Amino acid sequence: RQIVLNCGEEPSVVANTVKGGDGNYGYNAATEEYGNMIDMGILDPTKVTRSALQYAASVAGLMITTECMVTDLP
Amino acid sequence: AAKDVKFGNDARVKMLRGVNVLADAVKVTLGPKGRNVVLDKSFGAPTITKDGVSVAREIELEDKFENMGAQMVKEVASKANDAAGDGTTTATVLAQAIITEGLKAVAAGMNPMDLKRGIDKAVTAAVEELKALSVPCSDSKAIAQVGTISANSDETVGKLIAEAMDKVGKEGVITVEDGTGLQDELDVVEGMQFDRGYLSPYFINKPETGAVELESPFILLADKKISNIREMLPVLEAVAKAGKPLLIIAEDVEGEALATLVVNTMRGIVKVAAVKAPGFGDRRKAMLQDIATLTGGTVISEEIGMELEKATLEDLGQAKRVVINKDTTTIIDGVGEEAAIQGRVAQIRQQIEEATSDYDREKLQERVAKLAGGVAVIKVGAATEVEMKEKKARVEDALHATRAAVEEGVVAGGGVALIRVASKLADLRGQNEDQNVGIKVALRAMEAPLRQIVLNCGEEPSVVANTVKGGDGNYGYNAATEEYGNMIDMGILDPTKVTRSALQYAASVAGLMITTECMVTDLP
Amino acid sequence: AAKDVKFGNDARVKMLRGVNVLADAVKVTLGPKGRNVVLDKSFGAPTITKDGVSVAREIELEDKFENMGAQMVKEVASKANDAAGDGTTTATVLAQAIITEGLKAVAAGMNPMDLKRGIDKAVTAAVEELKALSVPCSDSKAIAQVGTISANSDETVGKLIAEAMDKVGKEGVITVEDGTGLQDELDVVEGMQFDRGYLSPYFINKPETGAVELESPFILLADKKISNIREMLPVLEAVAKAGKPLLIIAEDVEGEALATLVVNTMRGIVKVAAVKAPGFGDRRKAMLQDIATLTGGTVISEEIGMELEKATLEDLGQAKRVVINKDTTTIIDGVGEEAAIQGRVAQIRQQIEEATSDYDREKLQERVAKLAGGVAVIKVGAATEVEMKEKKARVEDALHATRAAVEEGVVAGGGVALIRVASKLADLRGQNEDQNVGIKVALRAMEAPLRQIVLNCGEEPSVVANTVKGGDGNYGYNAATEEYGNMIDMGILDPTKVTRSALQYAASVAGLMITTECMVTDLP
Ligand SMILES: Nc1ncnc2c1ncn2[C@@H]1O[C@H](COP(=O)(O)OP(=O)(O)O)[C@@H](O)[C@H]1O
């Protein structure tokens, strides 16, 4: 949604049509064509997409479960 | 007072915040997934409402300039309502859209007066296009469908309206009032009845209903008020020796006249009723004549050189039966020269044509209903008072929209009709390029109502508009069922008159507003 | 109150800011590419307008000195308007110009009183020049053109005015009021009609229109009010045995007089109408006499030793036909001694000549129109009320400008006429050099309206002025089509009287203003 937004296109619209597909069908923001992202040479190593996700999730749960915060006086 | 003057983009920006605060409070209520707004009241409990014009009237802003914005768009929502009593939110939504876009093109350095001309041209064209898409709504099912859709998808309101319209006919009145219990209720008064109780309660000839029931009686219409038994005797006598009972509708009956009339029926000498004249002032005599016609009687008007005393059986009206209680009199089937009824009707029917206002229009078509079809009343049910208000309002809303469908036809709802005429004008151009952007500004706004409807569902407005735009005719999105289909078949009908008025009024003020270059108001 | 007094350059600078705030709010609206100003109102919705005097009256400033500036120039815009009902912005623009330039020359150390003499000399000259450039505007095409140009290039307004002017003639009135629908509409009342409904509604002899239609009747004009049938009998009788019907225009008809008259036609004894006298007070008898003349009747004035009873058929007026409804009476073609009509017209025509105000001028030329040509009404259409106001105002504006063209002719618009007379006065000098700069100050200001017109289009004013200055006669810039040409051929005509008044009034105050050396006002 963010990539699309940064490009100045509609996120919801690009998002919906990417979801309408299967496999590695996607939107290439650089060229504005839909297709197979891998064929089109837009790929992330699996490690990195996963790691990003897991790490985002970790810190988010950590926060959702934080009840107290200690720090120095202003 | 000393004034604060603001110019150009400054004044416009403020103006637009103004438009926005209002527009946004009104928007939240659009469509089947609309939500409610609460409007406070120094009075008593706040008001919960879905009704765009109700929200609109409340918005007033602290920023004198933002306020001017708000107080201006406020009129689209207001006029929309005086025009067809529905579509006020849509209207608002279109204006906020025409303005947003318009202003953006003024910032592009276009000539606002041309932006306006284009917007107007676009619109004149859109209106023709709507009149072309419009198909008549004449069967009871279609009527129920506009009613229903108007009442935020309340099938019961639709049905009740449809039912009423069916009974009182085309020239019959339908009014809505608070009900006693929890359920909605439809009353239909048959024939003619006015708001008039007996002057003599000691005359009720049926203690069971607490009401007077005169069988096949004569009817005395007195223009003047009565106080003396004297003037009656000549007439009262002819009736006494005729056997039939007698109703008396005078301006008033009091004194020993009223008193003696009691003892005259209390004994069994004559059977005679007394009830005030329907109305007040110059309306009374007009209405008292209506009764004469329906019963084949002559109005004894002391005005036009006539004595009550010199009336004979001749001048008396007649009826099949009469029903009078403490609050209303009802004449059941009067003699009424058939040709003289519809003639006196077609004459009052044209009195509404040249009615120089709204009030001399109301009372007239009321009277026609009493003389022609029937009178209907809807009673809205509610557990609470916060509920009675919002429900009652919707029933009123729908009552209006049906009346609008009947006179002007229906188009596809969900804002499809508008999205459809916008593709039909894809090729409209004006005298110059600024005018062309101006045209395009309006066509784009025409997508607004569908876009809000969808946004109110929490779905993507530009995905829905995209697929709707990808179809034809009456293809549209059913927000309630979240599936696409033919809007007419699904019974999602807007009355054409309202779709058209929303466009007209919104464009009419939006147009002007985008031509603001200076704004003058008071200091804070 | 204790006062703040300011002197010299200080006081002037303040005064100028005041001028400027006002002038700039008024400017934005000049020409075909003008824009609107929004004026707030504690009342209700704000007002959107293009009309310079409307904006002007709203400007009041917080700085008591700046205010004084604003409140002074405000009168040019105001006077311009009382004078010809148009050109107020132009006027304003010219004053802001004369002031700016003038003050600059006072700071140069010139003697302001001479700067004034120069300006005035420059202007007296410019006015002669204009009367020379003026060509009469007399055909319907030219009239439509001034109308059109006045209504911000609205061809329809131009045409409607032109049409009206053509029908009611030269001594006929034209008024503008809110219309019922969306489109503009022109009504022309034929012959004579006044604002008077029947006193007896039970006398309508055509239920179709709801109106009285007396064929070839007699007319009784009673100066006194009637209450008794007595005074009628002698006359009422002569008419009864003559067959012809009878209209009665008295001060009033009530009591049993009115009542019996009803039963007299209700039976078929006589055919007789009753309607109040047109007007009130000393105006009534004046107007009631008008009717006598047009129908060849004698006013039975109880004042000048006359009894209603002793009137015969002799004194009665006569008409071809009469049309009376609930609101208006109309006499169609009365006997009217031809010579006695135009005589009574040429007499009332001169009553306007010596009319010591504006009101004893209005009513008089109203009456002449009822007795001579016709009365016309224009109805302005609008979707909204924010629209009705602005549109109606423009139609009024143009209505005025045409009347000005007709009495004083037309010159080339776009402010070419003024740019033209400035080159004609390139050689004007005064008694001394200050006066010469003073003259040059005005010639320079004479370029302002064209320069604003151009600025408001977003083009370079000194490039357009330069090429316009480079041509001759009626060469000028068409801001609407962005090309040069002959302004009269292009139908861009200003009414000479407004060009001239804008110059005169603006110079009149700007002149004084630049001679301020001290200013006294209240403490903040
Ligand atoms: N099931 C639905 N799906 C899509 N649109 C609907 C549905 N029901 C009603 N509508 C549309 O939503 C609009 C909402 O009406 P409402 O919220 O009262 O707006 P307004 O005050 O402008 O009448 C109507 O135009 C109707 O076309």
Ligand SMILES: Nc1ncnc2c1ncn2[C@@H]1O[C@H](COP(=O)(O)OP(=O)(O)O)[C@@H](O)[C@H]1O
């Ligand atoms: N097509 C046009 N091109 C150039 N000037 C025009 C055109 N149309 C009207 N005008 C001029 O613009 C002036 C503007 O009229 P308006 O804006 O009402 O100012 P005012 O209130 O001073 O009358 C008129 O003097 C007329 O000469």
Ligand SMILES: [Mg+2]
């Ligand atoms: Mg609605």
Ligand SMILES: [Mg+2]
């Ligand atoms: Mg003007």
